[PDB]
TrEMBL record:
Belongs to the TonB-dependent receptor family. The keyword Disulfide bond does not apply. Cu(2+) 1 binds at residues 78, 82, 258, 260. Cu(+) binds at residues 78, 82, 258. Cu(2+) 2 binds at residues 78, 260. CDD domains: ligand_gated_channel. The gene is oprC. This is Copper transport outer membrane porin OprC. It comes from Pseudomonas aeruginosa (strain ATCC 15692 / DSM 22644 / CIP 104116 / JCM 14847 / LMG 12228 / 1C / PRS 101 / PAO1).
Length: 657
């Protein structure tokens, strides 16, 4: 019951991880959902700068992970992804983080070929009048301050709750003492009044605001705003009937409003392109909903339901007077909408509790996806001159069925669990894969017209051991991807992208173990590996993270613990130069490295606990393979992968009344 700083999370269920995001973590994470995922084998991150990095599971990027917030989808607005759905997540304000790896549920949304990611606040629960409160201040290296506060009130009949937070940091320094252009600033706020007449009933109303900024070393333009709004409603009922157990119906509305410029967080680099002040305001509106009933009756259980979603994108950008010098910011011009996405689907997950020692799970879902191209001109003539968009007001759709079957079995003698499982998944294309690139497949009108859905057929096997003193888990995967969406780069003349559809093989795994040595000594270990190949070009896939290992040693006695952790990462030699995705590209083979860190935590009293840690003790100078290239407007020669941070100190008090 001693405290602890989190250095890793073992696999709880098969293919499932469940962590508490309110616990302190060793490589101390930004106010950002991608960072609270680094602590789970299988997860790399594209560094942009301070925060707001693009998550990556088993080498797969972007929408292939289905990243949810209270069951609802929080989508970004920028066409280059400086606001991935993680950028609007501050995980501290959430109670639970589940991750389902591989395409092994149909319950939570469409076309999660790579994996599923859940951020949940669990409903408040009282009994008599009451009031909880938790708070955490956090301070460390480089002007880093994080406040966070969660607070309830209510009784048997209802409740009210306010989570919020505020975080920020200044430009950090790398291992060679450079100042990396990468501050940030963030705040969130969320009310949640909930009504609970019988103990078999619940409604919940959720309003939220949020905003933030982020300097980006990797790009020629900074986030000076990622405003958010969010309203939503959740309805659930317990035991309608001897068979019908739950009825879950809910709605969400998530609006993302994101200004992005080159003058409010930096001076415009006159040297090359964009020597002009330029803003670009963009927004993204999301409405969607979900309805599911559950039926436990026999050695059997079944979740069937439908859901649907619609989202809308609009953009508008400054113009500069090249000759009189009268900048006119982008808000004085009309919101110019450009894309609309629709989805409707119906799903089912049937579970068979054969024996104690055998389970069977099989899920199916059918989806109907649609998108309309609302852009009338396209900025892509000569010097980007206005051209007639040959897909103006067009609209395509598709009905895309996914499914899976998983077989878990518990060995007779020892606490071991084996599991194999097959799954097939189809994903309609992204905003950024349809609209962002400047060229579609090789002989086409644009990308919207020709890019094809992505079909992934993946095999997921693995095992679990829950010993008295030894815990160990293994998850592996081998699978193939049809019409994998892929980006290609080439040198007003910046760099131009071509999205194509290629055929690709993939395979990898993760594995981990922890051993309880003495009652005070604990050692833990975790390994993570990914492999991917472009089958239709006899070449490796781009942007795959190289082999990675982490070794943990901790000591604890009743009231406190301390620990140290070892991260060693192999070099990536399989690259795909000038091929990547909408945020980034493979260019150069990466260098292995290792980085050591130290943590400790100390429980003062029932209500207050204390931890602190040191990050990258020996101040290693290193950069990670996935990280972007640096602007060269901050001093970045050629394709300089944006460096990691150096040695770093942080401390954090966790209050809990
Ligand atoms: Cu942007």
């Amino acid at each position: 019951l001693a405290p602890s700083v989190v250095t890793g999370v073992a696999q709880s269920s098969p293919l499932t991880i469940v962590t508490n995001p309110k616990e302190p973590r060793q490589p101390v994470p930004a106010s950002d959902g991608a960072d609270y995922l680094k602590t789970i084998p299988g997860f790399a991150v594209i560094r942009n700068g301070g925060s707001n990095g693009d998550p990556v599971l088993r080498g797969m990027f972007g929408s292939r992970l289905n990243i949810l917030t209270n069951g609802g989808m929080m989508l970004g607005a920028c066409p280059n992804r400086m606001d991935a759905p993680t950028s609007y997540i501050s995980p501290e304000t959430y109670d639970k983080l589940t991750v389902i790896k591989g395409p092994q549920t149909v319950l939570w949304g469409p076309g999660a070929s790579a994996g599923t990611i859940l951020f949940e606040r669990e409903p408040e629960r009282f009994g008599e009048l009451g009031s909880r409160v938790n708070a955490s201040l956090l301070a460390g290296s480089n002007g880093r301050f994080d406040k966070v506060l969660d607070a309830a009130a209510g009784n048997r009949l209802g409740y009210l709750r306010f989570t919020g937070n505020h975080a920020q940091s200044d430009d950090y320094e790398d291992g060679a003492g450079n100042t990396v252009p990468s501050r940030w600033k963030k705040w969130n706020g969320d009310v949640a009044v909930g009504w609970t007449p019988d103990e078999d009933t619940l409604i919940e109303l959720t309003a939220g605001k949020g905003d933030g900024e982020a300097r980006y070393a990797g790009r020629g333009m900074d986030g000076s705003q990622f405003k958010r709004e969010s309203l939503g409603l959740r309805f659930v009922k317990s035991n309608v009937s001897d068979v019908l157990e739950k009825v879950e119906a809910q709605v969400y509305y998530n609006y993302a409003d994101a200004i992005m410029d080159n003058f409010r967080l930096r001076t415009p680099d006159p040297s090359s392109m964009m020597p002009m002040p330029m803003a670009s305001q963009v927004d993204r509106r999301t409405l969607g909903g979900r309805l599911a009933a559950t039926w436990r009756w026999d050695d059997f259980k079944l979740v069937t339901g439908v859901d649907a979603m619609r989202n809308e994108h609009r953009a508008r950008g400054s113009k500069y007077d090249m000759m009189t010098d009268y900048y006119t910011d982008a808000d004085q011009f009309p919101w110019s909408k450009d894309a609309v996405f629709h989805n409707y689907g119906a799903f089912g997950e049937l579970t068979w509790f054969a024996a104690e020692r055998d389970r069977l799970i099989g899920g199916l879902r059918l989806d109907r996806a649609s998108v309309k191209d609302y852009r009338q001109t396209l900025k892509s003539g000569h010097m980007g001159h206005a051209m007639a968009n040959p897909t103006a007001n067009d609209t395509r759709a598709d009905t895309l069925p996914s499914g899976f079957v998983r077989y878990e079995h518990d060995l007779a003698d020892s606490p071991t669990t084996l599991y194999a499982g097959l799954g097939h998944a189809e994903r309609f294309p992204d905003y950024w894969e349809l609209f962002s690139p400047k060229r579609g497949p090789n002989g086409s009108v644009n990308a919207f017209d020709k890019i094809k859905p992505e079909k992934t057929t993946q095999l997921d096997f693995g095992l679990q051991y829950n010993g008295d003193k030894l815990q160990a888990w293994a998850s592996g995967y081998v699978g193939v991807v049809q019409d994998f969406i892929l980006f290609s780069y080439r040198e007003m003349m910046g760099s131009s992208t071509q999205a194509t559809n290629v055929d690709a093989r993939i395979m990898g795994g993760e594995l981990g173990a922890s051993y309880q040595l003495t009652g005070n000594w604990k050692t833990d270990a975790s390994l993570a590996y990914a492999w991917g190949k472009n089958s239709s070009d006899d070449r490796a896939l781009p942007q795959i993270p190289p082999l990675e290992a982490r070794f943990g040693l901790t000591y604890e006695e009743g009231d406190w613990s301390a620990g140290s952790l070892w991260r060693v990462v192999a070099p990536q030699n399989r690259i795909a130069r000038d091929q990547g995705n909408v945020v980034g590209k493979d260019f150069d083979k990466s260098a292995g490295f290792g980085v050591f860190s130290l943590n400790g935590a100390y429980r003062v009293t029932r209500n207050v606990k204390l931890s602190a840690g040191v990050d990258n003790l020996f101040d290693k100078d290193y950069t990670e393979h996935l990280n972007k290239a640096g602007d060269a407007g901050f001093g970045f020669s050629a394709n300089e992968t944006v460096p990691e941070p150096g040695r770093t100190f942080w401390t954090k008090v966790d209050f809990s009344f």
